[PDB]
Design a protein around this ligand. Structure first.
Ligand SMILES: NC(=O)c1ccc[n+]([C@@H]2O[C@H](COP(=O)([O-])OP(=O)(O)OC[C@H]3O[C@@H](n4cnc5c(N)ncnc54)[C@H](OP(=O)(O)O)[C@@H]3O)[C@@H](O)[C@H]2O)c1
Ligand SMILES: NC(=O)c1ccc[n+]([C@@H]2O[C@H](COP(=O)([O-])OP(=O)(O)OC[C@H]3O[C@@H](n4cnc5c(N)ncnc54)[C@H](OP(=O)(O)O)[C@@H]3O)[C@@H](O)[C@H]2O)c1
Lengths: 315, 315
């Protein structure tokens, strides 16, 4: 009997990445519902789905996600919708004897002034970035729902905290606040237009971390499928999440120059240092994941190149 | 037209305190539903109630609450039920054009190693007490739901963070982890039995803060009814909650000796200092509330005496 695996949010960036890998697995039967078929905000509908579809495992990749403008403009929508989706799925899963779930956090969940690189223990150690506060609180509440169900009911609801992601199915619009898809699109257009330069705000000095979504999906399946005793040995019940990333930083400068090369731009990348930089360094400590035997396979250069080719095929 | 005021959880300790004060108000029409009439976990039922009952203001005093054993034994129930009750009420209120709401936090929401006395700005500055973590995360999510609805939709969803409360309608069982009702009952029984001593764990040295629930209710109505511009001047949109307490500490020793006197116990109060004390001091900074023009009226001695008389009438 193949395991029946529900990938919530399977048309999303991360959900689709997990689907492309599991779609290859003869030991897995995927159960998929679009938003039109199942509105994850509707408690009744979510319970009815779990009460009729005989699910074994859930990948919780459904969420209301956006960039800086969206998070500051629709804060109520970000906190409410994520709290409801998470609560409805985790509670319905439990009520229907679904023992295995993988929840997705976000690195934006860590305190603004966290110690770098950020180990899992940085969670809740200080105040949040205001732009992401509503979203972050709902994501932290999701982790704590999983841990609470694990502790009270002996569930196996695991969680992963990705770093910045990029890859197929992203939003490739020049005004995206997420730097990889924005820069890919900006450099693509500047290359098409023969623009003499592309100006990036800031000095280029801050160090950040990036992981291709197919690596994220692989790590998530890896973490989901570890035997429970191994997962327990490398986590704590009230500190259960696992950072997923490279553990390696690169300057914004390096990233922009690499994107320029990947797209074949021959103008100048220019940084405007009159605009402020964020903190000097932000990256995850991925010791737990590496101790668990998973290491990322996609280098930045290779991942940016394949991402750009996906964009070119999907304009 | 009297304001139509829904007191969610009106048979609870705090809800009933607010009801006893508003029941005197000819400018207010109370709308009350017991749990059997309206299950606040049921999104559909909550929306239907708001879509039919023409509410002007909500006091959100419904919650899953307990002591140390309950919070550690049923963590999933504490986080899930509080997230759902809060989400359902705040979202339904907003969808039905209910502009005014008062949410109740809890002082247990502050970081374990917070700076004392704890100003509102201590929220989220550090890790939580593990016993209360699930509950605390759902309460913090409730504050952040209110702030997000205020920011996105221009609502007036205010919040109060009470200190330790005591008074009528508490749980007066000797094994209650809440020290006032437990000690009242233990000393009452030791007085009835002529027991030679009553032994309290710990040294008696820690300093804590206590507020009678009728003072809490008065402060909550006060905060609810301030003009918006005054409330805005004394809060910030993403730091909106108001501590409610005395701002004055007393040792556990003082509290126990006072309870002994109030009950007329003539045996010895004994502290067993072989058992550990918690942190040396925990109390709220109530500068915001005092600046808002509210000061508590019930002294510890007077409040303990009237609480004990309520117990004696309700055994
Ligand atoms: N670097 C990081 O730290 C990082 C970055 C990205 C993602 N992640 C994690 O991955 C999660 C997903 O991100 P993503 O980039 O894959 O988001 P996404 O591409 O925006 O996908 C989320 C999916 O959820 C669905 N969804 C939302 N509300 C739903 C509802 N009410 N009913 C049913 N489906 C609903 C979607 O449908 P519609 O579009 O039709 O609404 C969308 O397909 C994030 O929340 C975060 O936990 C973390
Ligand atoms: N010192 C402090 O910091 C402190 C202390 C106490 C309270 N407070 C605040 O006051 C809040 C209330 O505390 P409390 O002591 O008044 O609690 P309580 O006495 O236990 O009352 C809560 C009320 O909510 C109701 N309720 C719970 N789930 C419901 C549901 N699904 N549908 C409808 N009604 C439901 C109740 O009904 P049932 O009993 O029938 O379940 C109970 O009447 C706390 O959450 C906290 O925010 C803070």
């Amino acid at each position: 009997a193949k395991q029946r695996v529900f990938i919530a949010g399977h048309r999303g960036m991360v959900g689709s990445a997990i689907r492309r890998q599991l779609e290859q697995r003869g030991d897995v039967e995927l159960v998929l519902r679009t938003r039109d078929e199942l509105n994850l905000l509707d408690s009744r509908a979510v319970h009815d789905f779990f009460a009729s579809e005989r699910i074994d495992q859930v990948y919780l990749a459904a969420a209301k996600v956006g960039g800086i403008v969206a998070n500051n403009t629709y804060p109520a929508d970000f906190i409410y919708q994520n709290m409801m989706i998470e609560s409805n799925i985790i509670h319905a899963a439990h009520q229907n004897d679904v023992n295995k779930l993988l929840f997705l956090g976000s690195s934006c969940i860590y305190p603004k002034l966290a110690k770098q690189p950020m180990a899992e223990s940085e969670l809740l150690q200080g105040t949040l970035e205001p732009t992401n506060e509503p979203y972050a609180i709902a994501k932290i509440a999701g982790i704590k729902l999983c841990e609470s169900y694990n502790r009270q009911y002996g569930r196996d609801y695991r969680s992963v905290m990705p770093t910045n992601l990029y890859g197929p199915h992203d939003n490739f619009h020049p005004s995206n606040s997420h730097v990889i898809p924005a820069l890919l699109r900006r450099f693509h257009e500047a290359t098409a237009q023969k623009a003499p330069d592309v100006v990036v705000w800031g000095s280029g000095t801050p160090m950040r971390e990036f992981l291709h979504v197919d690596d994220m999906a692989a790590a998530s399946i890896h973490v989901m499928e570890l035997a429970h005793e191994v997962w327990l040995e490398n986590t704590q019940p009230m500190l259960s999440h696992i950072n997923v990333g490279t553990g390696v930083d690169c300057t914004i400068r390096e990233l922009a120059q690499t994107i320029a090369k990947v797209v074949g731009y021959k103008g100048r990348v220019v940084f405007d240092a009159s605009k402020p930089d964020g903190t000097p360094r932000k990256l995850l400590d991925v010791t737990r994941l590496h101790q668990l035997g998973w290491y990322h396979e996609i280098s930045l250069e290779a991942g940016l190149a394949s991402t750009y080719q996906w964009f070119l095929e999907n304009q």
